[PDB]
Structure formats: C-alpha cells, structure tokens
Design a protein around this ligand. Structure first.
Ligand SMILES: CCCC(=O)OC[C@H](COP(=O)(O)O[C@@H]1[C@H](O)[C@H](OP(=O)(O)O)[C@@H](O)[C@H](O)[C@H]1O)OC(=O)CCC
Length: 513
C-alpha cells in the first residue's frame, strides 16, 4: 500500500515503517518512508486520499541528522533533507525503531551516487519511448534553417575533434573569409579558446549574434591582430551598420578585475569599429547567494507584512531584470539596429548562454515552438558547454561547492516571464518549463549530464541514457499551450522592469496547497 511506484530499472533500497513526516503546512503524519535508486517516497494511509511525498533523490543536496536519544522532545529525533527545489523535508524517527541510521546511510548513498562510485539513475533508467530525443538536434540542419553555410559564413570542421576548443561544439560557423590557421590564433587570445562563432543570423539584414569568452588582454594592453581582424570580418559580412556591438555581460568593475587577472575586454583603441556595452549582470557566486536569500523568505511560510521589501532584499528579481534587459538590448540592436553583435562574459558559458538564447527567443519564432525550444537548449546550452553537472552538482555530496549556481534556472525563469507577457507566443506551457527544471535535478535523463558536448560523446549518453525530449515529445498534450498560434514571425519585446516582472509562484512557492 504505502510502497512506491517503480520506473523500469528502479529498485527499493531501504524502507522504514512508522516514520513521521513533519509537514510545515498540515502537520505531522506517520507512514512509511522508502528510498529507491531514483527517489525518496513517503506515504501514509493515516489520512485520506493517502498523504504522499514523492521527490527525486537528485534534488537532495544535503541530509542532516536531527537530535539524539539525548532529545526528549516529540519528533525531536530524525532527519532533514535540504533540497534544490525550494524546500526542505523533515522526518522524525523513533530511536528504538532503529531506522534512522539505515535511512540516513541509504540516502547519502543513493542521492549522491557519484560520490559513492555508483551510477546516476539515468544509466539504470530503462523505459522506452516512441520518439528518440537524441535525434532532435542536428547542428548542420539548424544552420541550414538559418540559411547557413552561405557567402558570408562558412562551416569549419577544425573542432571536429575538439582540438580548437574542447568546450565548444564539433561544428563551428565563422566568417567565410577566415581560414582555420587563423581561427587557431584567435583561439589563443580568447579565454579557453572559446572564439567568436555564430549563434544566429537575421534572415533579412544578415546582422548576426556571435558568442565567445573574454579576450586575454591582461595588465599590459596585449592585443591580438587576428582577433581584431576576426571581429572586423564579422562586421564586413553585415553590409549595413558601419559598426559592431560587443555586449560584455559583466559589470565594468568585474571586467576591469578580470583584466587584472589576465582577461579583460575589447578597448576602444584596439577595436576601432566596435562599441562595447557592460550589462551589469553579476557572477555565479552572486546568483547562488540571491537564490539562497529567496528560499529562506518563501519557504515554509511567507511573512506577508514585508513580502515586497523582503523580496527586494533577495535581489532575485533584479537579477532576472538585468538578464532580460540585456537580452532585450541585444535583440533590439540586431532587429531595429540592423547591427551585428558579439556577446561574451568572462568564460562565455554562463551569462553568455543566458543572453544569446533569450535574445534568440525574442527574435526567432522557431525557438518558441516546443521542438525549437528543445533545439535552443541543446544548441546554446548543451553544445556550447554550459557546465551543467558542475553547476548542479549531480550525485555529489559536496553541497558547499562554489561552482553550484542557478544559471539555467534563471534562464528558465526569464523564459517564463516572457511567457506571462506573451500568452500566445509560445507553443509550450508552464508545465513544460517546470518539468524541465524538475529533470534538471532528477538525473532521470542524460540530457543535463556532463559539462560539454565532448564529454557527452565520450560517455555515449545518446546510447546509454534516455533524452528528456524522448519523454516530452512522445506525450505532447500536457506541454502544449492551447492559445499558441496567434504569432511567430514577429519579434518579442518584453518589458524588463520591477513592475512588469513577477516572482514565479508556480515554481518557487508550489509546495503549499
Ligand atoms: C583573482 C582572485 C579572485 C577570483 O577567484 O577571481 C575570479 C574572476 C572570475 O570572474 P567572474 O566573471 O566575476 O566570475 C566567473 C563567471 O561567473 C563565469 O561565468 P560567465 O561565463 O557568465 O563569465 C563562471 O563560469 C566562472 O566560474 C566565474 O569565476 O576571474 C578573473 O579575474 C579572470 C579569469 C581568467
């Protein structure tokens, strides 16, 4: 009865009878706690419908022991799982029941398989679907859709074996007149060899969106004649504007600080035909801290009296605002400015991925379809080396790792904001976005594992794991926006202000009924 449902490949690893779950909203409820290789399940027939708590082990970052027998209090002895999904779960065990240690140990083992030399559930998950999500994204075909390779832009195979840049995809689009040996020189000037490459091209103006990492200028004004020519080549392809725009996602202070560490930005002297703009979007450590502050004000209980000022102090929505405002500036420079833009950050993987993809969503209605959005994720995030496994910490017990940051979560939040402002512009619904966020942590699928395309290939995820798109695409009805259709040629111009943006209740505050 209180036994959990099981996915093909899932197994019960431990079970504790008469454990009390301390629900923050309804109160204590005694039932059975079960741990599988995929989830934590709690069910009690001591209510009606039975009470059911079902969470993927992947959302657990920590597990803490609460009390000892040296605790006389009612439900003072037990466990608490701190979760990535904007909650914490607290259970109470009876010392004489001798279940706490066992549950604690099995949780530490199965929620953090990587740390315990076990596989992530995605490799054990053996269900089969009608569609194969791994066949969804085809680089060459996406470029074709964009009218890519052409006269101005060619496809180079120089990174066919990730020699040029190992955090980059295999195929890269660069200016038709720039030879590979030259790409190699630009690569030594750009951080981690993440040179400027095409993300999107306007079908009418030929203004483009390129992306890259910061130029290694350093404390002395080191210049790269080839990088300068490369950017000039980017500009010479767009026959319109007599200038290019470089959007550095960082606040100026951080760009200057990077220069001090060896990196930097494109100066007015070195890049004569480029205008650089700082977008004031802070780093991963700042975003991690903003979410931490938000979780503490939304979960368990909100203090309504100071909601607005408490929300303000998190600076969550301010970050969302700066990210959307930056994407907006990029889209507008390309669309109404007919100007090409180069987008970067320090590393070019985090903020840069947020910026290109959001601008792209505004500009191209294709990315607003369910399949096109899946392509966008596979393209700008996965193939371009947003370090997913490190930013999420899949199956790793090191909860304090400073590499963990809600970068993709912020992106999805921004997508949801547009979805609110344009209720008929997207083919997918909110449920689709929340589902993506749940599986970002679940590790049921192989879609968000590994930190680069090269890694996913070496680990052969297409053949060893199931794609999230396989699940989603073979089951559309749930993720389709019924209002969709009344748009999708035109550019989206969301408004980025503290008065037009909201806190995504459906996601951050979904645990209270
Ligand atoms: C030096 C002592 C203090 C210290 O740790 O400074 C670190 C700074 C980090 O600079 P930041 O831009 O403030 O911070 C970086 C960005 O958040 C980057 O994202 P994105 O792709 O959006 O750029 C993350 O991937 C990096 O892990 C993070 O370090 O980097 C540098 O100074 C230059 C690196 C060559």
């Amino acid at each position: 009865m209180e036994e959990p449902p099981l996915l093909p490949g899932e197994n019960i690893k431990d079970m504790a009878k008469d454990v009390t779950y301390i629900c923050p909203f309804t109160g204590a409820v005694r039932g059975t706690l079960t741990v599988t290789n995929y989830r934590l399940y709690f069910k009690s027939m001591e209510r009606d419908p039975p009470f059911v708590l079902d969470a993927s082990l992947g959302v657990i970052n920590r597990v803490e022991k609460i009390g000892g027998a040296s605790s006389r209090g009612e439900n003072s002895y037990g466990l608490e799982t701190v979760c990535k999904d904007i909650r914490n779960l607290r259970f109470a065990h009876k010392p004489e029941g001798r279940t706490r240690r066992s549950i604690f140990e099995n949780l530490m083992k199965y929620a953090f398989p990587v740390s315990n030399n076990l596989p992530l559930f995605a490799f054990e998950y053996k269900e089969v679907f009608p569609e194969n999500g791994w066949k969804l994204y085809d680089p060459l075909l996406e470029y074709r859709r964009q009218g890519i390779p052409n006269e101005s832009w060619r496809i180079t195979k120089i990174n066919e074996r990730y020699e040029l840049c190992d955090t980059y995809p295999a195929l890269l689009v660069v200016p038709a007149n720039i030879p590979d040996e030259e790409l190699k020189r630009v690569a030594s000037f750009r951080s981690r060899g993440r040179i400027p490459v095409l993300s999107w091209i306007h079908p009418e103006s030929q203004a483009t969106i390129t992306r890259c990492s910061q130029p290694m200028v350093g404390v002395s004004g080191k210049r790269s004649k080839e990088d300068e020519k490369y950017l000039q080549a980017i500009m010479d392809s767009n026959a319109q504007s007599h200038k290019i725009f470089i959007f550095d996602a960082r606040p100026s202070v951080n760009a200057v600080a990077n220069k001090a560490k060896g990196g930097g930005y494109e100066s007015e002297d070195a890049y004569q035909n480029a205008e650089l703009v700082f977008l004031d979007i802070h780093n991963i450590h700042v975003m991690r801290e903003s979410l931490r502050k938000l979780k503490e004000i939304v979960y368990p209980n909100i203090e309504e009296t100071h909601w607005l000022s408490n929300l303000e102090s998190t600076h969550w929505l301010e970050h969302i605002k700066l990210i959307l405002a930056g994407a907006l500036r990029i889209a507008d420079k390309v669309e109404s400015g007919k100007t090409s833009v180069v987008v970067h950050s320090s590393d070019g993987w985090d903020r840069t991925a947020q910026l290109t993809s959001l601008a792209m969503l505004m500009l191209d209605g294709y990315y607003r379809t369910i399949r096109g959005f899946e392509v966008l994720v596979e393209k700008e995030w996965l193939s371009f080396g947003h370090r997913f496994q490190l930013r999420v910490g899949h199956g790793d017990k090191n909860h304090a790792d400073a590499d963990r940051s809600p970068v993709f979560l912020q992106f999805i939040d921004c997508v949801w904001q547009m979805t609110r402002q344009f209720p008929t512009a997207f083919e997918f619904n909110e449920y689709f976005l929340i589902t993506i966020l749940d599986h970002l942590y679940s590790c049921l699928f192989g879609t968000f594992l590994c930190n680069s395309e090269q890694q996913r290939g070496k680990e052969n995820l297409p053949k060893r794991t199931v794609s999230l798109w396989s699940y989603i695409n073979s089951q559309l009805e749930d993720f389709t926006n019924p209002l969709y259709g009344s748009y999708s040629n035109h550019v989206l111009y969301p408004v980025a202000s503290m008065r037009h943006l909201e806190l995504w209740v459906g996601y951050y505050i979904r645990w209270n009924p």
